[PDB]
Amino acid sequence: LYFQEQPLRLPSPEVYRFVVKDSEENIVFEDGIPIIKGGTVVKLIERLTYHMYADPNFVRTFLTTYRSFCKPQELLSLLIERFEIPEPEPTDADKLAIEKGEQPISADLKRFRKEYVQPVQLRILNVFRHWVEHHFYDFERDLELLERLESFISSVRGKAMKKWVESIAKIIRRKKQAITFESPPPPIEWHISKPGQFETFDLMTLHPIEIARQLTLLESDLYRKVQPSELVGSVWTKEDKEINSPNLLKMIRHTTNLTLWFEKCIVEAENFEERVAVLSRIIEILQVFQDLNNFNGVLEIVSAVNSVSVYRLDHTFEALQERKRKILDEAVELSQDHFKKYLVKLKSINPPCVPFFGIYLTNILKTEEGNNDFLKKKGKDLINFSKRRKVAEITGEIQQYQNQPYCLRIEPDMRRFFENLNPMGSASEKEFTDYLFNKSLEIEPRNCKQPPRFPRKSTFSLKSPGIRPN
Numbered sequence: 017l018y019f020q021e022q023p024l025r026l027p028s029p030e031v032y033r034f035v036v037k038d039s040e041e042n043i044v045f046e047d048g049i050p051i052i053k054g055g056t057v058v059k060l061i062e063r064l065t066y067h068m069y070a071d072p073n074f075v076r077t078f079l080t081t082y083r084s085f086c087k088p089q090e091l092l093s094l095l096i097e098r099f100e101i102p103e104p105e106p107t108d109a110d111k112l113a114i115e116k117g118e119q120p121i122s123a124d125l126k127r128f129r130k131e132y133v134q135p136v137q138l139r140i141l142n143v144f145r146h147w148v149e150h151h152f153y154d155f156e157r158d159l160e161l162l163e164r165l166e167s168f169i170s171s172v173r174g175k176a177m178k179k180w181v182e183s184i185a186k187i188i189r190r191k192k193q194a195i196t197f198e199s200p201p202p203p204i205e206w207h208i209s210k211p212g213q214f215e216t217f218d219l220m221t222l223h224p225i226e227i228a229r230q231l232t233l234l235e236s237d238l239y240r241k242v243q244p245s246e247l248v249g250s251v252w253t254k255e256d257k258e259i260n261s262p263n264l265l266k267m268i269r270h271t272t273n274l275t276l277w278f279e280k281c282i283v284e285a286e287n288f289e290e291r292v293a294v295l296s297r298i299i300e301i302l303q304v305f306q307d308l309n310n311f312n313g314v315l316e317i318v319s320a321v322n323s324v325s326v327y328r329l330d331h332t333f334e335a336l337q338e339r340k341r342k343i344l345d346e347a348v349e350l351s352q353d354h355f356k357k358y359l360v361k362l363k364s365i366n367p368p369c370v371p372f373f374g375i376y377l378t379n380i381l382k383t384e385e386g387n388n389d390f391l392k393k394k395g396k397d398l399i400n401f402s403k404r405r406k407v408a409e410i411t412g413e414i415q416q417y418q419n420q421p422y423c424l425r426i427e428p429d430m431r432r433f434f435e436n437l438n439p440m441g442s443a444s445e446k447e448f449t450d451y452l453f454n455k456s457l458e459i460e461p462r463n464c465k466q467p468p469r470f471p472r473k474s475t476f477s478l479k480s481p482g483i484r485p486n
């Protein structure tokens with residue numbers, strides 16, 4: 017900084033392309049280590065394993081987002097390329113010293129091994145360790161990928177690196193092999209259906225408290241298992257979505273099925289009094305969702321009542337008692353003005369909770385369309401890494417809620433019930449949508465002043481048992 021030291025002697029870029037001089041044609045920074053704006057994947061690998069210092073934020077973000085610009089096998093081969101560093105060509109005077117014998121190696125070569133080769137190779141081992149610790153799904157999906165890595169680390173010689181090599185193997189071994197309650201969870205609630213009679217489970221026969229409890233437990237596990245990589249690059253809306261985003265797709269599809277299920281229960285309840293009781297039950301489920309801070313569950317219900325087939329059922333909503341109507345309307349207002357009220361309430365609740373997942377998926381899609389994958393250059397175009405960082409910022413917001421277990425006991429039969437809901441049946445989404453609205457027109461025809469009379473579907477009481485535990 018206040019004096020320029022002797023430069024480090026490096027091998028030729030014809031035998032080690034990672035030493036090619038930095039320029040605006042292969043790497044750009046954002047105008048405290050510098051923030052990388054983009055570059056070639058070679059230059060990103062170099063800064064990923066830079067010899068001058070460590071960069072833990074770049075390593076984490078790279079390993080979460082790299083799949084949007086580089087293949088897992090491509091990355092392993094790049095790290096092995098980085099590791100096998102040739103030494104500079106010895107000078108004529110250096111060769112003479114070796115020939116003489118019993119001569120300490122050149123000061124330049126000692127500097128090179130100590131200030132470059134060793135630090136770079138250690139940064140690579142650090143990358144391998146972060147990879148298998150936090151992204152081991154790359155190795156579950158690709159078996160040749162793992163065997164290559166394990167083959168390579170077994171080729172590493174040197175006492176100074178054996179601690180690292182054995183730490184990587186210890187992590188892999190822990191991975192390859194892979195409920196307590198601090199205070200007693202409340203007793204399971206049952207209504208008309210009884211334990212074991214899973215064939216009779218339905219919206220009005222299960223207990224409303226337990227429906228909310230069990231959906232919260234299910235939606236909590238689904239939310240917890242989403243990995244940030246499943247959201248980068250909108251890979252869940254792309255060709256290999258089933259492989260790259262399995263947990264995220266299970267979260268979206270649960271939400272789709274449960275929202276269509278609530279709609280189905282309202283419209284298919286043709287008797288007017290029975291239908292008002294169904295809607296009131298769903299609002300009771302909504303209130304326990306809010307008591308449990310399950311905003312995903314809340315907004316799935318808001319989503320159902322906003323569907324056209326339900327929204328038009330004016331005589332049903334008008335028959336609702338004023339109190340349950342007010343609860344529902346407060347919930348609906350959470351979503352208004354781009355979820356303005358929802359966002360201030362999320363920031364003020366204590367764990368455990370289940371956030372609304374749709375706001376992340378929507379905000380990520382806008383970043384995807386609002387930032388180009390590349391930066392434009394005369395020659396080769398650079399990878400836009402700032403874009404990946406921006407998406408990584410949002411995926412970090414998802415992870416801060418995923419370590420919050422609920423103090424609720426799992427009911428296995430009800431758990432299978434909600435995992436196996438198939439409201440559409442054999443119809444397509446299009447076919448089912450038309451069928452719902454057609455059934456809505458039937459149960460409350462246009463411009464009717466009194467809902468038509470339909471026979472009651474069940475013989476049991478419409479009275480809810482309420483949301484008060486016993």
Ligand SMILES: CC(C)N1CCN(c2nc(Nc3ccc4[nH]ccc4c3)nc3c2CCCC3)CC1
Nearest residue numbers: 321322326327328329330333334341344345348
């Ligand atoms: C006429 C047309 C606009 N209808 C009205 C009924 N309706 C809803 N009403 C209400 N609230 C409510 C109900 C009855 C009331 N009676 C006096 C005030 C009052 C307020 N909330 C919602 C929906 C739809 C689902 C989202 C939540 C659907 C649209």
